[PDB]
Swiss-Prot record, chain B:
Quaternary assembly: Part of the 30S ribosomal subunit. Contacts protein S5. The interaction surface between S4 and S5 is involved in control of translational fidelity.
Domain S4 RNA-binding per the UniProt entry, residue ranges: 90-156
Species: Mycolicibacterium smegmatis (strain ATCC 700084 / mc(2)155)
Originating gene: rpsD
Region (Disordered): 1-41
Protein name, entry field: Small ribosomal subunit protein uS4
A Pfam family it matches: Ribosomal_S4
A GO BP annotation: translation
Swiss-Prot record, chain C:
Domain KH type-2: 38-106
UniProt organism field: Mycolicibacterium smegmatis (strain ATCC 700084 / mc(2)155)
Keyword Ribonucleoprotein appears in the UniProt entry: yes
Lineage top rank: taxon: Bacteria
Family: Belongs to the universal ribosomal protein uS3 family.
Tagged with keyword rRNA-binding: yes
GO terms, biological process: translation
The protein's name: Small ribosomal subunit protein uS3
Assembly: Part of the 30S ribosomal subunit. Forms a tight complex with proteins S10 and S14.
Gene Ontology molecular function: any one: mRNA binding
Role this protein plays: Binds the lower part of the 30S subunit head. Binds mRNA in the 70S ribosome, positioning it for translation.
Curated annotation (Swiss-Prot), chain D:
Protein's UniProt keywords contain Lipoprotein: no
Molecular function terms from GO: rRNA binding; structural constituent of ribosome; tRNA binding
Residue(s) carrying 3-methylthioaspartic acid: D88
Functional note: With S4 and S5 plays an important role in translational accuracy.
Gene assigned in the entry: rpsL
Disulfide partners: none
Name of the featured protein: Small ribosomal subunit protein uS12
Curated annotation (Swiss-Prot), chain E:
Keyword Ribonucleoprotein tagged: yes
Molecular function, one GO term: structural constituent of ribosome
UniProt keyword annotation of Oxidoreductase present: no
Amino acid composition bias (Basic and acidic residues), ranges on this chain: 1-18
Keywords: Ribonucleoprotein, Ribosomal protein, RNA-binding, rRNA-binding
Name of this chain's protein: Small ribosomal subunit protein uS5
UniProt free text on domains: The N-terminal domain interacts with the head of the 30S subunit; the C-terminal domain interacts with the body and contacts protein S4. The interaction surface between S4 and S5 is involved in control of translational fidelity.
Amino acid sequence: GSVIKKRRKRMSKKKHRKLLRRTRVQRRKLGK
Amino acid sequence: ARYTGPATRKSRRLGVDLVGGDQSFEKRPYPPGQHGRARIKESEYRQQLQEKQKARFSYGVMEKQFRRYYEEANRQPGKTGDNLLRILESRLDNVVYRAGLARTRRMARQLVSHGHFLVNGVKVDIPSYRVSQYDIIDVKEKSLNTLPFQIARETAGERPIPSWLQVVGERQRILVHQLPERAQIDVPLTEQLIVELYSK
Amino acid sequence: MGQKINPHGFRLGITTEWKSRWYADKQYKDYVKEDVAIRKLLATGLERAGIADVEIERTRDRVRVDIHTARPGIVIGRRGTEADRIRADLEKLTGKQVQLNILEVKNPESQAQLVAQGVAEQLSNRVAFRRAMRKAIQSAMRQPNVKGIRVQCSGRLGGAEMSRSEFYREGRVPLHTLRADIDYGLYEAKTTFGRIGVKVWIYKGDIVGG
Amino acid sequence: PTIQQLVRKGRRDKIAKVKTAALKGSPQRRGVCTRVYTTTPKKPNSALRKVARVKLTSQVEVTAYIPGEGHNLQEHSMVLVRGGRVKDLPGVRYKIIRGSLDTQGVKNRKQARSRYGAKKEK
Amino acid sequence: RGRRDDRGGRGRDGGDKSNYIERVVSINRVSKVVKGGRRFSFTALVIVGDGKGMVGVGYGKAKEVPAAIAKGVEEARKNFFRVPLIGSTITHPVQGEAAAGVVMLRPASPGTGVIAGGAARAVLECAGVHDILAKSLGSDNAINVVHATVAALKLLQRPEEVAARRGLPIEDVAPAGMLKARRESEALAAAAAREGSA
RNA sequence: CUAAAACUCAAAGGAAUUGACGGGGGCCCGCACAAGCGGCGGAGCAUGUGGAUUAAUUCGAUGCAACGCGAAGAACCUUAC
RNA sequence: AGUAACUGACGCUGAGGAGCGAAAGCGUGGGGAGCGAACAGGAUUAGAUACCCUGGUAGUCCACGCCGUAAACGGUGGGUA
RNA sequence: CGGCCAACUACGUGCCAGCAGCCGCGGUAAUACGUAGGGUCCGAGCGUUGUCCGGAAUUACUGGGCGUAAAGAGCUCGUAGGUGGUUUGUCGCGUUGUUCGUGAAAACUCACAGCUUAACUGUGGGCGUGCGGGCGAUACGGGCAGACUAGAGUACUGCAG
Ligand SMILES: [Mg+2]
Ligand SMILES: [Mg+2]
Ligand SMILES: [Mg+2]
Ligand SMILES: [Mg+2]
Ligand SMILES: [Mg+2]
Ligand SMILES: [Mg+2]
Ligand SMILES: [Mg+2]
Ligand SMILES: [Mg+2]
Ligand SMILES: [Mg+2]
Ligand SMILES: [Mg+2]
Ligand SMILES: [Mg+2]
């Protein structure tokens, strides 16, 4: 089909990965 | 509750004569109200509801009673329309109105509610009394020697007595042989539309 | 609707004639004044009676009117009640006499102005404008020595709000051709909602008329 | 398809989709009223809807709209909240009944006669 | 649709034979985009048929509602359709499948009454059925439902026809009740014919 | 990887049909581009418009397609301020 | 594929499970020509932390192991007449 | 009382006050708001709230699909399961027919009867979709005892990569 849903999923995954990269250090400090 | 408004209004709104003998209907065939010349869109549901409303306003029956009659007709093994027409014509008010002892359906209902008959020698004051086969409808002397009953029995020239009703003489003892049928009733309006409406 | 020029207004000196054919030095003003006054006076009457053209000519201090009525009998009723009445009205409104002389048309369906008047009356009589235009086109094309027709009823059709301009035509109606002898009719109908325009074109034949 | 799969596991309902958190299905409830103010509907309809935060007796806090023209209730009043639906107001799913405990009916009303708590005039 | 029951001063207004039960399903405006502005049109879904059972659907397209209705009527008259019947009901239960319209039709006893959607009830009333059941399962449309009804009616077959196709006489294909109903319908038709001729 | 809940929306999607467009392509025109001529834009005069006053600066046109337009006649009149 | 001999139903799928599994990334010991994440500058842009240019650390390669992710698209499961 | 859905005329409110279940209606000329009438539905009930179902084929066994609407696991091996070629005999677990007892009373319905009709009530049946025992049937699903190659796997001679 079109690429609207694909672009939405890409944006969501990119924001999730950015949040993960930001909170990586905190998650590691909590899981150490 | 019993209807009290004018019957000519409903007759003109529906487009058919409900009382039979009337001149206002034929003089003003258009629906009543400020808007009687407006073109109304043809609708199957509209016509189906108008048929049931005509039947109701002509037979003087409530909506719950009509629904119960339709349910009993559908429950019966026969056909819905004919069964409903039969159970509606078997009423004592319409029976005595068609037998010639009354001029209008309203007058027949009033008389049968005032307790002026004797079903099998027992008093009755319910217009919804459904007669049966070989049933006898008598009249007490107090209501027989009165003015309205005398006029009703002497003016027996409006319509002929059907095959399922008979007058056995001057006593106005209404006798029924069997239940009515489609050909014996000969109702102007049909019943298929009312059946299709109530079967929604 | 469109920028098409009036064929009569364009060929007023080539093919079509003029409704006011006279000349006067410094008195043309009063002449046209009396002309438009007579026109406004006869508007309602001759519109209810059916009018096609009012040709007015000026003579030595008198007038010469020629009105083309379609339905004779409404304006010409009893001799001394309607015709003489309107004549006396015109005379007392103007500063001279009026030797009114009516001329009957040969076919109401062949005149554009009469077709426009009829279709406007039909539309105002609360009827279907489409059917009215169709029947008018049929009447005007039932071999009244014609070859083409084009009727248009613009404005608020059907008492609505949108300015619907139904373009209805039949036959051959060329506007760029000069050798056309096409008759034109412009009418303004008054309804309970506003104004309506009626533009008619009747291409009779390809007569030179030189 | 795959009657074996159907017998193994599958063919279950989707969800109950509770309409409103009626707290055991109470059609009409009461509570305390607070901050009777005005809200703005969406862009297709510009108006001022009179709403108020109602703390019902079921340990819940919602926002109810007062239908009608003139509202008589105010801070610390006894109202009758019922389940409604307002499309123009995003997030409002409750209304108030006028003329139940402390609310007053609308003035100059002889057509509705059922909602807004309109009485019969003599 | 308006100003049709008039009385013109012309010779004839359209009074002729072929008084079939014409019925319109729905009429919706169709728009087309061009270089400046939009052009509107009208599509009419008409169904014309005789009370005997011969039905026919049409699809008129024009720029006016009356013209579209007339085009649909002409298309229906040009493309007819035959339908079998047993007295007043359908022959056997069927399930027609159009592109997306799946219309299931079932018989019924005399006096039940037709029950179907908008377009289905319209086409069935235009046909010679009075007491049957029908249901359109999806596609939420009218043209597709009409086509599905047409396909269902086409999938039907007469009793004598199927008997002659399978190579067997009567009483070996039709049930006893269906045969009795067919005999009653034939008797009623013969009575109507003789009472109309005499 | 297993995987929801609250909240929100009256849609979100799939195919094709007609307009608009591609700094997409192909076939062609307009003193349109190129060469030339005479200019506006540089200064004074004439008005019109924008903007500011005003007892009133009547009213408008808001590009191309309004701005030597309505003024093809403003001391009273025209003029509606 | 051919011979068609051999047992004569031993045929197909498969919940969990097991194996393989594009590129990218990590550990160990090497190597690293070219290309090339990040990084430096040169240039346009009002702003270029990018498209363009110049050098280049990981990566791209080898052996031992790991996560099991792709438009892993024929977006179309395996088997039968 | 705009279309769904049985039913319109005028005054005041003209982004306001409001109406409303979905579409959704008002920015001076609202059949969509209030008010006056007129029409429609019902009638001692009428509209609303909360709940369950039909429509919604909208958990599709009766009743859908998985290329582009939601969807073939990225691909293979395999446990339990599902399932299975032709044919002879045999058991009859499934299936089918019959018969006995139950499936309470009660409930729905067919017929009759009473309370003036009806609601309501009583009587004779169907139903109480099943279950427990006996017998019959063997084509089919199932088990056991046999046979065979069209499926399955192996053998010998060549073949592309
Ligand atoms: Mg300049
Ligand atoms: Mg302007
Ligand atoms: Mg100019
Ligand atoms: Mg002055
Ligand atoms: Mg697995
Ligand atoms: Mg690698
Ligand atoms: Mg490494
Ligand atoms: Mg580089
Ligand atoms: Mg795959
Ligand atoms: Mg087998
Ligand atoms: Mg029992």
